[PDB]
Structures are given as C-alpha cells and as structure tokens.
Design a protein around this motif. Structure first.
Motif, short mmCIF file in Angstrom:
data_model
loop_
_atom_site.label_atom_id
_atom_site.label_comp_id
_atom_site.label_asym_id
_atom_site.label_seq_id
_atom_site.Cartn_x
_atom_site.Cartn_y
_atom_site.Cartn_z
N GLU A 86 0.83 -1.21 -0.17
CA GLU A 86 0.03 -0.01 -0.07
C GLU A 86 0.72 1.38 0.02
N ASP A 87 0.26 2.19 -0.30
CA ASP A 87 0.98 3.80 -0.35
C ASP A 87 -0.26 4.64 0.32
N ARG A 88 0.54 5.53 0.95
CA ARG A 88 -0.23 6.63 1.39
C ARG A 88 0.56 7.59 2.05
N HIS A 98 4.82 10.91 1.82
CA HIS A 98 4.28 9.69 0.84
C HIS A 98 5.08 8.62 1.11
N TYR A 100 5.63 4.00 0.98
CA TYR A 100 5.33 2.92 0.28
C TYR A 100 5.38 1.70 1.35
N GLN A 101 4.38 1.10 1.63
CA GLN A 101 4.48 0.19 2.65
C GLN A 101 4.13 -1.14 2.26
N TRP A 120 8.49 0.29 5.10
CA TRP A 120 8.06 1.23 4.37
C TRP A 120 9.54 2.08 3.79
N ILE A 123 8.96 7.84 0.19
CA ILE A 123 8.96 8.36 -1.15
C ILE A 123 9.20 9.58 -1.39
#
Length: 141
Positions: A86-88, A98, A100-101, A120, A123
């Motif tokens: 996932e990314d959040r 931001h 990237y998990q 993570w 980013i």
C-alpha cells in the motif's frame, strides 16, 4: 563460536545499517525487531518497542507513540498468506510524507504462520532529493 559473531555482525548491519525502516511482528502483534530507520522516524529506542504492540483500536488517552506508528504500519488482516503493498501519505512532526508500505508473512514450515516482516520507504525523501538537484542545475543554467 565464529557462527555467533557472524550473526552478530549481520544484526549490526540489519539494525544499525539499513536505510529503510523494517520491522518484524509476530502473530499476536508483538514487535520482535526494528532497525534504526524505524526507531529514528519516531525518535525512540528499542526498549520502547520490542515486546510491545501497536493496537488497531484507539487506546485510552490517545498515546502518541502508538498513534504515530499505526499510520506507518498496515492493518492486521485475517491471517493473510500473501504479500501486501500500500502507499499513502503520513503526517508526523509537522511533515507529511508519501510512503510505500509492505508486509511479507512467514512461517516455521509446516504451513504454520508465525508473523510478518514489514516496513516502508519514504517516497517524499527521494522526490526531495531530485527536486533539490533539478532546482540546483537549473539555477546554474
């Protein structure tokens, strides 16, 4: 005896010498390992994390450390046997990143799941570097 030092040297690199946050969480949610990239994101030491949990539900008193870590981690799915990604955006220390998990589950053979490896990648940290270098060369043109 040599076998132990090689593992120790391996742990020195894994914990003190890896750039992206990485952790290991058992089935019951207890944290077994986390490198300095993990710990320094929050400005804490290993003694505050190892053997302790990041509950999914809100704890009384809204404790900060657990709250902040929950954002970077992924929810505990009903015993998932496949990698997750996932990314959040996450906000911490007045800065929004931001990220990237990811998580990978593992077992002790026999098909028996025992925990997840996860972490993570920041980013925004990469984009900042590219943005600063592009603005620099442009300013020289």
């Amino acid at each position: 005896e040599r076998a132990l030092n090689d593992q120790l040297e391996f742990m020195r690199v894994l914990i003190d010498g890896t750039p992206n946050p990485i952790y290991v969480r058992d089935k019951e949610g207890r944290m077994l390992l986390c490198n300095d990239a993990y710990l320094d994101t929050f400005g804490v030491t290993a003694d505050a994390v190892l053997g302790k949990t990041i509950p999914e539900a809100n704890v009384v008193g809204d404790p900060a450390l657990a709250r902040e870590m929950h954002e970077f981690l992924l929810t505990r799915v009903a015993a998932e046997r496949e990698p997750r990604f996932e990314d959040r955006d996450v906000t911490l220390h007045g800065r929004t990143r931001h990220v990237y998990q990811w998580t990978i589950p593992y077992g002790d053979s026999l098909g028996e799941l025992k925990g997840i490896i996860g972490g993570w990648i920041d980013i925004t940290e990469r984009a900042e570097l590219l943005r600063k270098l592009h603005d620099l060369k442009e300013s020289l043109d």
